[PDB]
Design a protein around this ligand. Structure first.
Ligand code: FAD
Length: 272
């Protein structure tokens, strides 16, 4: 049989109860929410995400999240969240709306989930189904490798795909991740990524860049650039799929221009 799914209809909101909050580090949390029963699964295809919605200080706020759990997990969904506190970053004095609201929640409070959403679904063994828009059928494309460029919170769409590939021992797709962050301290999910590298180095290539580097730093410094794409993503000759998720200026200035300079078809580079 198959487990009951939570996300039965994408236009329904499902209020899920907060059951655990882990303080990962000063500004990182893992939130665990109960599904409708211990035997349910979320029902989130690999490649897709959920939305959280809430009334935050009187206004509707909707944001996308990719869980760090999977449909293998029965009874709960886990979200890893970077909390953007007010009065930290000079360009963002108010901090982040949904992430601070999540940080405010008490155990037992609910928040609305919806999904699945997104134009890309991973069908396994290198095959991706990518719709040009929601109203259109997917282009099925099968690749031997996947370049991945994540910035900041944009890691979780990548991690979800990486994990789905690595857990299939007969999936020979090679993932190459280039992961950008403000600082070393701000990197999400480093232990998790490094466990995957330890176990799956033949299929999983990992590299970091940071806007500013610590004194002891083994990786790159600066924004994603042409050299980093040449050195840390599959070459365009191999026709990889290129996936991206990060802040709009990162995609616009750092990623697309440099993917083009290396020769990847810019129009085929997919942004989550
Ligand atoms: C497919 C997808 C999956 C995602 N999955 C996740 C996930 O698993 N986990 C997750 O945490 N987010 C994830 N995000 C990001 C998420 O959607 C939100 O952008 C994030 O939670 C911030 O929203 P907010 O309402 O708190 O901030 P907003 O109010 O929307 O603030 C706007 C922007 O201001 C910047 N900002 C505000 N305060 C600061 C500060 N103190 N320092 C630096 N920058 C700051 C951030 O870039 C922020 O995104 C995902 C995004 C996408 C597209």
């Amino acid at each position: 049989s198959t487990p009951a799914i939570t996300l039965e209809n994408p236009d329904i909101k499902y209020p899920l109860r907060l059951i655990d909050k882990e303080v990962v580090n000063h500004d990182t949390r893992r939130f665990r929410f109960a599904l409708p029963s211990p035997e349910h699964i979320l029902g989130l295809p690999v490649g897709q995400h959920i939305y959280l919605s809430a009334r935050i200080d009187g206004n509707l706020v909707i944001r996308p999240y990719t869980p760090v759990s999977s449909d293998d997990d029965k009874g709960f969904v886990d979200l890893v969240i970077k909390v953007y506190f007010k009065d930290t970053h000079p360009k963002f004095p108010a901090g982040g709306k949904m992430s601070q609201y999540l940080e405010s929640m008490k155990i037992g409070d609910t928040i609305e989930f919806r999904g699945p959403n997104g134009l890309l679904v991973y069908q396994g063994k290198g095959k991706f189904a990518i719709r040009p828009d929601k109203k259109s059928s997917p282009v099925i494309k099968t690749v031997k490798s996947v370049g991945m460029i994540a910035g900041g919170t944009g890691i979780t769409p990548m991690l979800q795909v990486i994990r789905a590939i690595m857990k299939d021992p007969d999936d020979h797709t090679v993932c190459h991740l280039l992961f950008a962050n403000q600082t070393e301290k701000d990197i999400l999910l480093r232990p998790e990524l490094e466990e995957l590298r330890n176990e799956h180095s033949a299929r999983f290539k990992l590299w970091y860049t940071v806007d500013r580097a610590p004194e002891a730093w083994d990786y790159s410094q600066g924004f994603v650039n042409e050299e980093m794409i040449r050195d840390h993503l599959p070459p365009p000759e191999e026709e990889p799929l290129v996936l991206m998720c990060g802040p709009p200026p990162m995609i616009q200035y750092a990623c697309l221009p440099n993917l083009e300079r290396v020769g990847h078809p810019k129009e085929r580079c997919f942004a989550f």
